Design an enzyme around this catalytic site. Structure first.
Site, PDB file in Angstrom:
ATOM      1  CE  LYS A   1      -4.226   1.587   2.222  1.00 48.97           C
ATOM      2  NZ  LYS A   1      -4.302   2.783   1.340  1.00 48.97           N
TER       3      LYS A   1
ATOM      4  CE  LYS B   1     -10.187  -6.257  -5.782  1.00 49.81           C
ATOM      5  NZ  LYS B   1     -10.196  -4.817  -5.399  1.00 49.81           N
TER       6      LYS B   1
ATOM      7  CB  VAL C   1      -9.737 -11.640 -32.513  1.00 44.99           C
ATOM      8  CG1 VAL C   1      -9.581 -11.392 -34.007  1.00 44.99           C
ATOM      9  CG2 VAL C   1      -9.977 -13.115 -32.234  1.00 44.99           C
TER      10      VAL C   1
ATOM     11  N   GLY D   1       6.719  -8.646 -28.460  1.00 53.04           N
ATOM     12  CA  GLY D   1       5.391  -9.027 -28.899  1.00 53.04           C
ATOM     13  C   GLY D   1       5.208  -8.759 -30.381  1.00 53.04           C
TER      14      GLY D   1
ATOM     15  CG  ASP E   1       2.249  -1.404 -34.929  1.00 50.11           C
ATOM     16  OD1 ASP E   1       1.257  -1.612 -35.657  1.00 50.11           O
ATOM     17  OD2 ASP E   1       2.344  -1.849 -33.764  1.00 50.11           O
TER      18      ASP E   1
HETATM   19  C1  LIG Z   1      -0.110   0.263 -26.394  1.00 46.28           C
HETATM   20  C2  LIG Z   1       0.482   1.567 -26.309  1.00 46.28           C
HETATM   21  C3  LIG Z   1       1.753   1.824 -26.843  1.00 46.28           C
HETATM   22  N1  LIG Z   1       2.398   3.087 -26.749  1.00 46.28           N
HETATM   23  C4  LIG Z   1       3.771   3.256 -27.293  1.00 46.28           C
HETATM   24  C5  LIG Z   1       4.759   2.690 -26.190  1.00 46.28           C
HETATM   25  C6  LIG Z   1       5.182   1.339 -26.794  1.00 46.28           C
HETATM   26  O1  LIG Z   1       6.497   0.869 -26.378  1.00 46.28           O
HETATM   27  C7  LIG Z   1       5.130   1.651 -28.302  1.00 46.28           C
HETATM   28  C8  LIG Z   1       4.811   0.400 -29.127  1.00 46.28           C
HETATM   29  O2  LIG Z   1       3.595  -0.218 -28.641  1.00 46.28           O
HETATM   30  P1  LIG Z   1       3.611  -1.897 -28.388  1.00 46.28           P
HETATM   31  O3  LIG Z   1       4.287  -2.612 -29.497  1.00 46.28           O
HETATM   32  O4  LIG Z   1       2.058  -2.387 -28.160  1.00 46.28           O
HETATM   33  N2  LIG Z   1       4.392  -2.008 -26.862  1.00 46.28           N
HETATM   34  P2  LIG Z   1       5.972  -2.575 -26.833  1.00 46.28           P
HETATM   35  O5  LIG Z   1       6.853  -2.679 -28.040  1.00 46.28           O
HETATM   36  O6  LIG Z   1       6.631  -1.628 -25.705  1.00 46.28           O
HETATM   37  O7  LIG Z   1       6.022  -4.038 -26.165  1.00 46.28           O
HETATM   38  P3  LIG Z   1       5.840  -5.440 -26.889  1.00 46.28           P
HETATM   39  O8  LIG Z   1       5.493  -5.152 -28.427  1.00 46.28           O
HETATM   40  O9  LIG Z   1       4.573  -6.129 -26.407  1.00 46.28           O
HETATM   41  O10 LIG Z   1       7.024  -6.325 -26.884  1.00 46.28           O
HETATM   42  O11 LIG Z   1       3.968   2.489 -28.486  1.00 46.28           O
HETATM   43  C9  LIG Z   1       1.768   4.113 -26.115  1.00 46.28           C
HETATM   44  O12 LIG Z   1       2.274   5.225 -25.993  1.00 46.28           O
HETATM   45  N3  LIG Z   1       0.489   3.892 -25.556  1.00 46.28           N
HETATM   46  C10 LIG Z   1      -0.140   2.624 -25.652  1.00 46.28           C
HETATM   47  O13 LIG Z   1      -1.246   2.493 -25.131  1.00 46.28           O
HETATM   48 MG   LIG Z   2       3.306  -2.520 -31.944  1.00 43.02          MG
HETATM   49 NA    NA Z   3      -8.689  -7.216 -29.812  1.00 49.30          NA
HETATM   50 NA    NA Z   4      -0.251   3.924  -2.140  1.00 48.60          NA
END
Ligand SMILES: Cc1cn([C@H]2C[C@H](O)[C@@H](COP(=O)(O)NP(=O)(O)OP(=O)(O)O)O2)c(=O)[nH]c1=O
Ligand SMILES: [Mg+2]
Ligand code: NA
Ligand code: NA
Ligand SMILES: [Mg+2]
Length: 326
Positions: A51, A63, A94, A180, A247
């Site tokens: 906390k 929890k 999906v 990912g 992306d």
């Molecule tokens: C999902 C999301 C991503 N982002 C930015 C930070 C992430 O590092 C970057 C790429 O998104 P991502 O591929 O879903 N996240 P990741 O590359 O850090 O992790 P991983 O793909 O699951 O390995 O986009 C945001 O700023 N707000 C978000 O809600």
């Molecule tokens: Mg991505």
């Molecule tokens: Na989805």
């Molecule tokens: Na706190």
DNA sequence: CCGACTCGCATCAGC
DNA sequence: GCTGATGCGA
DNA sequence: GTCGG
């Protein structure tokens, strides 16, 4: 991960509030708490101990005490038994199907994988491809494969125009041993905050990557952002690589550092940094950092010449990409 | 106690 | 067709 | 669900 059980519980609760309750701020609340516990360098002994961390209030503390005492959470046990909750949580896995569409599909009796597969004509394009590669998209990508993909993307991009610069961000830039998906920042001197001296800058890149059969599918595609699917080449008699999400984000070249900071992440790190920016009287997006006039409207973009400059403004010590995995 | 918690692309409603 | 809101996602 | 004002 000293508190893996606790953080798993919180993540599962976060996913519930997001997918079923459709309460995005509860989702963020649970994910913030999960994040702050994940980096806590002690094995938590009580909800009171937890906390003290910022993001862990009374309800989560309770929890945690229940989980520590029993190894389970009754609130979660019930959610897992609920059919509507179980169906919605699955459908949202999906890509393209969110909480709203998932609930709509259930109402129409579409709630399983074969349900989706026999009702393909009721899916939009994004959802059809998400269903198509449902199994693949849940697989991780070893960094070794990420390195091959980086090699292909950067070279194919160079072949189009040598003045392009492609930078792989996301978890990869943070040095993750597995990702990912793949996240690519793209810049070209023709596209700045001042003007766009050339059309189809992102298009040409996407088309080239399709031409060599790296990009295989398109989820969405606009002036500055591509969202699609890619796959590594396999040699003779090899089982193919899984299809991977990719992306690609075109950013004005003079706004690179705000862009690379944004796309490097993590997503929770971005939320914390931008929230902190607000408390310091600035606002940050993937383009600029701007001050807030007391009246509450953003002013003009401040000079940025590195990632650290953005950290300096809001009075944070610089944190390497590898220390942004929140 | 309670207001508050950055943007791109697809899609749809309303005109 | 244009605008603005909603859904979904990075 | 949490918290700073
Ligand atoms: C999902 C999301 C991503 N982002 C930015 C930070 C992430 O590092 C970057 C790429 O998104 P991502 O591929 O879903 N996240 P990741 O590359 O850090 O992790 P991983 O793909 O699951 O390995 O986009 C945001 O700023 N707000 C978000 O809600
Ligand atoms: Mg991505
Ligand atoms: Na989805
Ligand atoms: Na706190
Ligand atoms: Mg990623």
């Amino acid at each position: 991960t000293l508190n893996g059980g606790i953080t798993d519980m919180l993540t599962e609760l976060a996913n519930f509030e997001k997918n079923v309750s459709q309460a995005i701020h509860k989702y963020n609340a649970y994910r913030k708490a999960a994040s702050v516990i994940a980096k806590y360098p002690h094995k938590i002994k009580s909800g009171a101990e937890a906390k003290k961390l910022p993001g862990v209030g009374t309800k989560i503390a309770e929890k945690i005490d229940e989980f520590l005492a029993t190894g389970k959470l009754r609130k979660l046990e019930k959610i897992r038994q609920d059919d509507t909750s179980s169906s919605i949580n699955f459908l949202t896995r999906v890509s393209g199907i969110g909480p709203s569409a998932a609930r709509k599909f259930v109402d129409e009796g579409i709630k399983t994988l074969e349900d989706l597969r026999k009702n393909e004509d009721k899916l939009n394009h994004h959802q059809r491809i998400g269903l198509k590669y449902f199994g693949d998209f849940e697989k991780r990508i070893p960094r070794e494969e990420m390195l091959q993909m980086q090699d292909i993307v950067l070279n194919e991009v160079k072949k189009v125009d040598s003045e392009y610069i492609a930078t792989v961000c996301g978890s990869f830039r943070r040095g993750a041993e597995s990702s990912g998906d793949m996240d690519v920042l793209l810049t070209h001197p023709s596209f700045t905050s001042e003007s766009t001296k050339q059309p189809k800058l992102l298009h040409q890149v996407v088309e080239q990557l399709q031409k060599v059969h790296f990009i295989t599918d398109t989820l969405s595609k606009g002036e500055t952002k591509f969202m699609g699917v890619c796959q590594l080449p396999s040699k003779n008699d090899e089982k193919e690589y899984p299809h991977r999400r990719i992306d690609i984000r075109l950013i004005p070249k003079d706004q690179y550092y705000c862009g690379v900071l944004y796309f490097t992440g993590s997503d929770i790190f971005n939320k914390n940094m931008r929230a902190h920016a607000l408390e310091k009287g600035f606002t940050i997006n993937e383009y600029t950092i701007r001050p807030l006039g007391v009246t509450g409207v953003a002013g003009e973009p401040l000079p940025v010449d590195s990632e650290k400059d953005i950290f300096d403004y809001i009075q944070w010590k610089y944190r390497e990409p590898k220390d942004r995995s929140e």
